[PDB]
Amino acid sequence: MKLKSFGVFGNPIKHSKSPLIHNACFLTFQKELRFLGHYHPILLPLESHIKSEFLHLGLSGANVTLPFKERAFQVCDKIKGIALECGAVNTLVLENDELVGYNTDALGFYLSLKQKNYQNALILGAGGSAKALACELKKQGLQVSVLNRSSRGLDFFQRLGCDCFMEPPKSAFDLIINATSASLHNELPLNKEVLKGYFKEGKLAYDLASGFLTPFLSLAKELKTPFQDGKDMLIYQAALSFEKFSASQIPYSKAFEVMRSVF
Template sequence: MQFAVVGNPINHSLSPLLHNYAFEVLGINAFYGRYCLDKEKDFRFLQTLGLKGANITIPFKEIAFSSCDETFGIAKKIQAVNTIVFCNNKIFGYNTDAMGFYECIASFKFKNTLILGAGGSAKALACILQEKNIDTTILNRSSERLTSFRGFETYTFDSFKPKKAYDLIINATPSGLENSFPIHKEQLIEILKQAQLAFDLVYGRETPFLQLAQSLKILIQDGKDMLVYQAILAFEIFMQSQGVVFDKNLLREAMKNFEL
């Protein structure tokens, strides 16, 4: 059995390490790799690569949704998937980002949050935060993507003037991969200075966003734990789609304790 993570850029992804380690620990004969996709296309082509399923990352989560024959859970609501499986010549889509993220902040008692970015990941996070009764505002560079966030307070970066403090600030843009700030530094300082936690979905590096938050004495967290939690859920979906029985407790123990 072969699986992969698909996106662009993709070389930084640690998902293969997590999944392949879990396969080894559980004694499952399978392999998980990376695939860099250079342009938008129907995700059915992944079957020609011999894949049984895939994780989808930036910037293809919404595009992959349109390729699915059927979607489940929160993926249907937000119209973005990060996990797909192929069964009976059909593509089934799921989103494990939402619960993977919430596992990371469940112990906090946040009342409100501000999300920077309006892509597929931002949709997943906004949806789960709304379900957990955490007031959520979304900021994005352009207004076009904000139209899909119905029921949320939304602003473009240029039009936003903070009128209140936000407990949680989430950077859901890929700015960390480009070693840049998601918005102007001065504006970001104004947003961050009264926050309790700054969370960047990028993992494996201390992004400018997190460095700035830390300099302001704000608690920081990168996307590593979210990666692990969403990977556990995706792994379960992959194996269940193939009828593979495995020890879920052993899976969780292996992924949580693996040193990335």
């Protein structure tokens, strides 16, 4: 019984449903994998260092949550897969003593979306989530607009062909995505009257927070606009992460089955 250590770095961190669904899968596939994984939440001080901490804890793999996803992309030894276009890393694997960075948010988000027929999207936020979601939605051929408070990640989104606005675009969007940290603060990501304008005219309000009904989602619910929280995304990207942690031994669709059940 070789033991292998995993975790999720975040700040804040201990509401994470991730250790439960990953340890479920580490328990289930012990025999295929030929080790027992264990997965813990990890409070990472803002002023620490993801790579150094990873090496010091002896981890075989990690997930990375806000606000460290852009930092993870910068400090990895090597970036593979769609991560390269996301400028954000949410999955870390030790491969050949090199810290390798993946992004499973993009495809995780893709798989959570039950409908295809959205023309355009407004993304709120500019962290690693917004970055992966913009990259995924452009890929699908939506028009993507991005609105942050201030000047953050301008160049990244510009270079994808996103329209980066200063003020709220006066325009209808099918898909309104909250990828800010606002729900965490129990806050709306935008002035309320503005958001209501988007909601009266949009097709789906989408919040990355999972579990609790956020101010953003509850206002969409109040206006009767269809809404979706981050639960389905969370299960998909975890499954996809797990496929990485398994060094491609266990395909994400098998992980997803155990994970969705347990959740």
